[PDB]
Amino acid sequence: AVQQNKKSRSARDMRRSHDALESNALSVEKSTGEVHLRHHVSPDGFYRGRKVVDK
Amino acid sequence: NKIIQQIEAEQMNKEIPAFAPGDTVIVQVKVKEGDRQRLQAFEGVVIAKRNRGLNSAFTVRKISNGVGVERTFQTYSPIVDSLSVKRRGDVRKAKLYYLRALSGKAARIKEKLV
């Protein structure tokens, strides 16, 4: 099955009105001042005020 | 389920002497034909046993008149007036469903003497 008519410029842009992206929840580790993902270990290696992996 | 266990616990007062699959038991069932109250005996080997508190059940098999018959009893039902173990058998399994394909000398259960 295929279209009998080609879609218009407006018609295919209304379908894409739901394609936007959402942002993530970011937090600032107050001990260091570093931005990280919420509930995740920072790229440095801190979580909730403690060293976990130390690179 | 904590309070369902208490509903069921008030209905469990019968004694129910211990028995095992493979045992030969005699069950006294209550029959109420008309207004009279008599007891009928059902004797056979216990092939299965279901241990679920008030929902306990067991199955006994016998050869009546050349026809095999199996009855599943609800242990705590008032229909089961009493129970007695005529003989004890020596088996390795919990369910003896293989006995249905054996007829005569092949379906004999060895006895547990000790």
Binding site: - | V31, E33, S64, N65, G66, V67, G68, V69, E70, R71, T72, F73, Q74, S77, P78, I79, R100
Partner: protein
């Protein structure tokens, strides 16, 4: 439960050994016959000088079934085979003896005769 083309043996001395169900009576689109249910059978195998013949269409009542029958307390009674009793035009047994046990739900108004003839009632 019995349906069309189920094979079941005879609990009588009417001369038939095997009968085959060809109709389950008592209702449109009815599917199964249990203990105490009337069916329509055809004789598939018979004794040389019995009182029924091979290829004969007649009425029977189911007396003993493999599926079983359940009681009011939850218990169930099962047998190792399906058996029937052949009936005449006025719904009475054709044979004079009955072989094997029967069940207490056969003690209706019209089947009390075959309950009394059975060696055992369960």
């Amino acid at each position: 439960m019995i349906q069309t083309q189920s094979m079941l043996d005879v609990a009588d001395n009417s001369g038939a050994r095997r009968v085959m169900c060809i109709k389950v009576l008592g209702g449109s689109h009815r599917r199964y016959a249990g203990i105490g249910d009337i069916i329509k059978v055809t004789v598939k195998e018979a004794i040389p000088r019995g009182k029924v013949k091979k290829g004969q269409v007649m009425t029977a009542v189911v007396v003993r079934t493999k599926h079983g029958v359940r009681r009011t307390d939850g218990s169930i009674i099962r047998f190792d085979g399906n058996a029937a009793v052949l009936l005449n035009n006025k719904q009475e047994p054709i044979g004079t003896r009955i072989f094997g046990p029967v069940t207490r739900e056969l003690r209706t108004e019209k089947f009390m005769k075959i309950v009394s003839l059975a060696p055992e009632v369960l």
